[PDB]
């Protein structure tokens, strides 16, 4: 060929820098960066800007994120907060397809009954133009 070929398997590595969305807990949908892994199943995470305390947490309650940033290992809350704000983690997260789908769920949950009648009207106004386009 002779560029051989391997797939390969792309994964989210459990490292120092890996920001992780907390899914079950008092936090439940806040970002926190991993500073030091304990043992294969347990991590150390601090989200100083999001406001989750530096805690040793089980891995069933975290979701690994595609986003990373160069943090030194076991760096304290002040060092984390500076390296976090430097790399701009919160912007890279808010500008995600996933963060948008979380913001869509919480918004459509926080919708009113009048705004439910409005969105219904507008979707049918949109639907008139798209069905004219689907015909041609």
């Amino acid at each position: 060929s002779t560029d051989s070929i391997v797939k390969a398997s792309n994964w989210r590595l459990v490292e120092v820098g890996r920001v992780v969305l907390i899914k079950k807990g008092q936090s439940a949908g806040k970002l926190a960066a991993i500073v030091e892994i304990i043992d294969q199943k347990k991590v150390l995470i601090d989200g100083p800007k999001a406001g989750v305390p530096r805690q040793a947490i089980n891995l069933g309650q975290v979701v690994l994120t595609p986003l990373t940033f160069a943090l030194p290992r076991g760096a304290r809350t002040a060092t984390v907060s500076k390296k976090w704000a430097a790399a701009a983690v919160c912007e890279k997260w808010a500008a995600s397809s996933w963060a948008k789908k979380i913001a869509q769920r919480e918004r459509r949950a926080a919708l009113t009954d009048f705004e439910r009648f409005q969105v219904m009207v507008l979707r049918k106004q949109k639907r008139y133009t798209v069905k004219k386009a689907l015909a041609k």
Binding site: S9, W11, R12, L13, V14, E15, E36, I37, I38, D39, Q40, K42, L44, D46, R54, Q55, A56, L59, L64, G74
Partner: protein, 169 residues
């Protein structure tokens, strides 16, 4: 679990003033246990029982730095079915208490040794690396460590799914 300082003295009977105040570092889920264990251990070392002595102080001890990752080298003794055996295990955790309850779980899992059949001889934090004996701890003490989590099993809150759920991460 909790770690408790327990200082019990002995009953002050005149002709014996100032008994020698014996301190312990009992691992217990509350004070009523921490003080019962204190007496249990000091009945194995000295001729004194809860009647012949008194607890002068009980104080919960917290972690000096409860967010620093620590290699806890714990020495333990346990009654097996056949005899008794002295063990050395190495827990890696963030608190002395969290490391100890992991030992109690991994002693119960690996040798069927229940709470009554275990003595915690010592729980000493290992100062400098290259003193870590056990490989299952020396694994996580490698420069610039990373590792994936293959076969990510997400869990539904509803009986039926429509997508054929994936196990990617």
């Amino acid at each position: 679990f909790k770690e408790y300082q327990v200082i019990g003295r002995r009953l002050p009977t005149e002709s014996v003033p100032e008994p020698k105040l014996f301190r312990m570092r009992i691992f217990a889920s509350n004070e009523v246990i921490a003080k019962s264990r204190y007496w249990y251990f000091l009945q194995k070392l000295h001729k004194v029982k809860k009647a012949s002595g008194e607890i002068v102080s009980i104080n919960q001890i917290n972690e000096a730095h409860p967010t620093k990752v620590k290699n806890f080298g714990v020495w333990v003794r346990y009654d097996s079915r056949s005899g008794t055996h002295n063990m050395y295990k190495e827990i890696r955790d963030v608190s002395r208490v969290a490391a100890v309850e992991t030992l109690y779980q991994d002693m119960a899992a690996r040798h069927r040794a229940r709470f009554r059949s275990i003595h915690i001889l010592k729980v000493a934090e290992i100062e400098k690396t290259a003193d870590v004996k056990r490989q299952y701890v020396k694994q996580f003490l490698t420069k610039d460590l990373k590792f994936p989590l293959p076969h990510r099993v997400q869990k539904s809150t509803k009986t039926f799914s429509y997508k054929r759920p994936s196990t990617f991460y």
